[PDB]
Curated annotation (Swiss-Prot):
Name of the featured protein: Papain-like protease nsp3
Portion of the full-length sequence here: 1567 to 1877 of 4405
Domain Ubiquitin-like, chain residue ranges per copy: 1-54
Ways its activity is controlled: Inhibited in vitro by GRL-0617.
Effect on the protein upon substituting residue 142 to D: In strain: Alpha/B.1.1.7
Length: 311
């Protein structure tokens, strides 16, 4: 009989005492210590006085779990601890003043997303996600990477798409004040104006150029003809312009950061391009430098505050 603590958020700690013969699974349910499954393991001396993550089994823990993670999915904690057991072993070097990830288990898309998040203004709604966001920007990104995999329903080693990962994260972020007003002009139908909010207001799939998005882009109308969609008003701290991988010239000072993707569909490699005093390329732990750049780009991130068109 030795005393321990059980928690679901590492904030509210509940005091318990455990028997040595019975395993943790017989007494608490699925139990984790430092991200390691100890459901079948039995108590030792070092376990006394230490805190254990446990699956919610009563209503008090069920409520605390939602208030930290904003999910009731019973599998979330297990998927989170499974990813964390890998991400704790990864290395997170500082590259060009930013926290990156040494390559491991196909994490190239995580590194590009992690580098992008440190360069755009974002506030997460789940307290677990925002707290780990802060710890990650300071250099301790293991818990943050595990949460990203858990919220995106992705496992370690699985092949990830950066645009898809950013979209999942934006749905758990406060983008309520973000607003986008578009205008589509068809020769026959006429002029239609639409207003988008939230995640739909910051993401566009179709073109990398924020300038071309303002000047107008060609989309098919309901009548079948090719109408023209252009941006009327944009109120958001950033925008994300995505397009299928293609050769693109990035000029210093015209953008914030970008995602480079080489190789075949789903089984390629991501790289991160950021515009500082010059153009920097971050590939995990490796860093290169160039005055101008041209390569296969699929995401470009631009700064914004409030924009209104002249048309
Ligand atoms: C509308 C047309 N479009 C939209 C996206 C793309 C696209 C095309 C190509 C493309 C084509 N040829 N080559 C040679 C490469 C490549 C990509 C890039 C950005 N990502 C992945 O490769 C990828 C997709 C994944 O999951 C995807 C599964 N998802 C629907 C649940 C998972 C992991 C990765 C790496 C994206 N084209
Ligand atoms: Cl929610
Ligand atoms: Cl949320
Ligand atoms: Zn409590
Ligand atoms: Zn929420
Ligand atoms: Zn691993
Ligand atoms: Zn591992
Ligand atoms: Zn990779
Ligand atoms: Zn029309």
């Amino acid at each position: 009989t030795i005393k321990v603590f059980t928690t679901v958020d590492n904030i509210n700690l509940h005091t318990q005492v455990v028997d040595m013969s019975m395993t943790y699974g017989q007494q608490f349910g699925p139990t984790y210590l430092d991200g390691a499954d100890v459901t079948k393991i039995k108590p030792h001396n070092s376990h006394e006085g230490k805190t254990f993550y446990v699956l919610p089994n009563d209503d008090t823990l069920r409520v605390e779990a939602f208030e930290y993670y904003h999910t009731t999915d019973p599998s979330f904690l297990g998927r989170y601890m499974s990813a964390l057991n890998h991400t704790k072993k990864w290395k997170y070097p500082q590259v060009n003043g930013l926290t990156s990830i040494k390559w491991a288990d196909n994490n190239c898309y995580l590194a590009t997303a992690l580098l992008t998040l440190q360069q755009i203004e974002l506030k997460f709604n789940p307290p677990a996600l925002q707290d780990a966001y802060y710890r990650a920007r300071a250099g301790e990104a293991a818990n943050f990477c595990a949460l990203i995999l858990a919220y995106c329903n992705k496992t370690v080693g699985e092949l990830g798409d950066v645009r898809e990962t950013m979209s999942y994260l934006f749905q758990h972020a406060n983008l309520d004040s973000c607003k986008r007003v578009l205008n589509v002009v068809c020769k026959t139908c006429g002029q239609q104006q639409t207003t988008l909010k939230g995640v739909e207001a910051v993401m566009y799939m179709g073109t990398l150029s924020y300038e071309q998005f303002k000047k107008g882009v060609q989309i098919p109308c309901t009548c079948g003809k090719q109408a023209t969609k252009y941006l009327v008003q944009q109120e958001s701290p950033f925008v994300m312009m995505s397009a299928p991988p293609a050769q693109y010239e990035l000029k210093h000072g015209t953008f914030t950061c970008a995602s480079e993707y080489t190789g075949n569909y789903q089984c390629g490699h991501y790289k991160h391009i950021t515009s500082k005093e010059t153009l920097y390329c971050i590939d995990g732990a490796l860093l290169t430098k160039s005055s101008e750049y041209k390569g296969p780009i699929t995401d470009v991130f631009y700064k914004e505050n409030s924009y209104t068109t002249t048309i």
